[PDB]
């Protein structure tokens, strides 16, 4: 199968600035008929993919001028002269030279804004849940940018492994921020063996990692 | 099989100014024919300046035998 | 408008079968080769299959060959995907899309010219969730506001919506009267095969003593509706 690669994988774009995405194929996509069989698609959050560019350089119907495709053979570029809020999403290249059609991995584009550190908040389990035999501890990082963040759970200073899951919102339309939850789940028995529950957050907007914590049973 | 360039160009002449950015009707009633459109990116070109190779897109249409 | 309207899909147990439909309106299906493309949760796009305009030369991704088959009925303007022996790996949104290259010229055989202009029309997608989990309504637990969720006069509070199946749940606050500052997070799939999400909202901390804050959680698959009042802590 033809292997497609893209770079970069994450592409924040300051308003007003252009953007460029590279796509490479493992085999030339230039056909004897003269066409380069390379498409670009955009998938906006929660939407179906939509065609931007076909045959390397042709704009699809309804696609704004700011999108252009260039390249030939194994080397192609999508250029976006400016990135509007409505252009956020994941950009895929796809070869259409022969089946199976194959896609790049996707490049995620968002709006680059001034760095904003998260507000870090923590919630102990409810007594209601504890009665049921389980303890969920929630750490909330609110309204931050960029999306990259490291959230680690420490229970009496011991790093937790394998017992938490994160969820992250889409970029907010108005303020270009994200919010993120990290949920630590333990048995009631394990939860009651320890005192200090801590969320440690690393982020570009923080000069050093921030720790939010509570003592079990105190509040 | 594939419609000839002669066929497609004859058809372009027959449809004259009904040619648009929307796919034309099939050029035939039976067998294989062509549909043509002005390429989306060529929509601003004056009709008299349209190039067969670069501005007109083509697709085969397969009607009943 | 010009539309591909997909139907079918839903929850299906491993090893069972599902049949997806893709009905065109505003275009004539016989003027297109048709493709299926899918996307597993949180992952990229994967091509699945194609069928030419006259039903010939069906082709498939290696990952589905032998288990899936593609078909069409031009008289009903509809495209189908038959999926047998489904596996967890097959959970995804499935999309149908058009192709002007009705007979596979250039990509499959010699051509005098190109006929491909991208996959320009896409269906809205069909979700197929391959799971043995049983339908189950959520437990709703308070995320109570405290000094540990309060900064600069603003307090965060929420509801944890845990252990439900299948998606989706909907969350409102105060019966929809509260929308500003709400973040309802995408659900996560747990080891157990059940979903869980949180909904949080920021409000003026001084309001906590007078204003009741209630999350309204609806899970239609189980006909579960839960109102949970979140009580504030003074610590």
Author numbering:
A (entry chain L): 1 to 27, 27A, 27B, 27C, 27D, 27E, 28 to 214
B (entry chain A): 309 to 373
C (entry chain H): 1 to 52, 52A, 53 to 82, 82A, 82B, 82C, 83 to 100, 100A, ...
Q: What text does the study give?
A:
Here, we expressed and characterized seven monoclonal antibodies to the C-terminal domain of CSP (ctCSP) from volunteers immunized with RTS,S/AS01. We determined crystal structures of five Fabs to elucidate how these antibodies recognize their cognate epitopes on the ctCSP or αTSR domain (residues 310–375 of P. falciparum 3D7 CSP). Competition and crystal structure studies indicated that the antibodies target two different sites on opposite faces of ctCSP. One site contains a polymorphic region (denoted α-ctCSP) and has been previously characterized, whereas the second is a previously undescribed site on the conserved β-sheet face of the ctCSP (denoted β-ctCSP).
TSR strands 1 and 2 contain a conserved region II+ and strand 3 includes another T-cell epitope CS.T3, which is highly conserved among P. falciparum isolates. Similar to the α-ctCSP Fabs, Fab1512 has a higher contribution from the heavy chain (BSA 548 Å2) than the light chain (150 Å2) for recognition of the αTSR domain, but intriguingly its interactions with the β epitope are mediated predominantly by CDRs L2 and H3. Fab1512 CDR L2 interacts with the CS flap, whereas CDR H3 spans the TSR homology strands 1, 2, and 3 and forms extensive hydrogen-bonding networks, which are mostly water-mediated, with the β-ctCSP epitope. Furthermore, mAb1512 exhibits a moderate level of SHM in the IGHV gene, comparable to mAb 352, and a long, 23-amino-acid, CDR H3, which is not commonly seen in anti-CSP antibodies identified to date. These mutations and long CDR H3 in Fab1512 may have evolved to optimize binding to the β-sheet in the αTSR domain. Overall, the crystal structure of Fab1512 represents the first reported structure of a mAb that recognizes this novel epitope on ctCSP, which exhibits almost no polymorphisms compared to the classical α epitope and, therefore, could allow for greater breath of antibody responses to circulating P. falciparum strains. Consistent with the conserved nature of this epitope, mAb1512 can bind with strong affinity to all 15 haplotypes of ctCSP that represent strains found across East and West Africa. Thus, the β-ctCSP epitope could likely elicit broader antibody responses and represent a target for structure-guided vaccine design to protect against a wide range of P. falciparum strains and minimize antibody escape. In the liver burden assay in mice, a dose of 300 μg anti-α-ctCSP mAb236 exhibits functional activity corresponding to 48% inhibition of parasite burden after challenge with 3D7-expressing sporozoites, whereas the β-ctCSP mAb 1512 shows 33% inhibition at the same antibody dose.
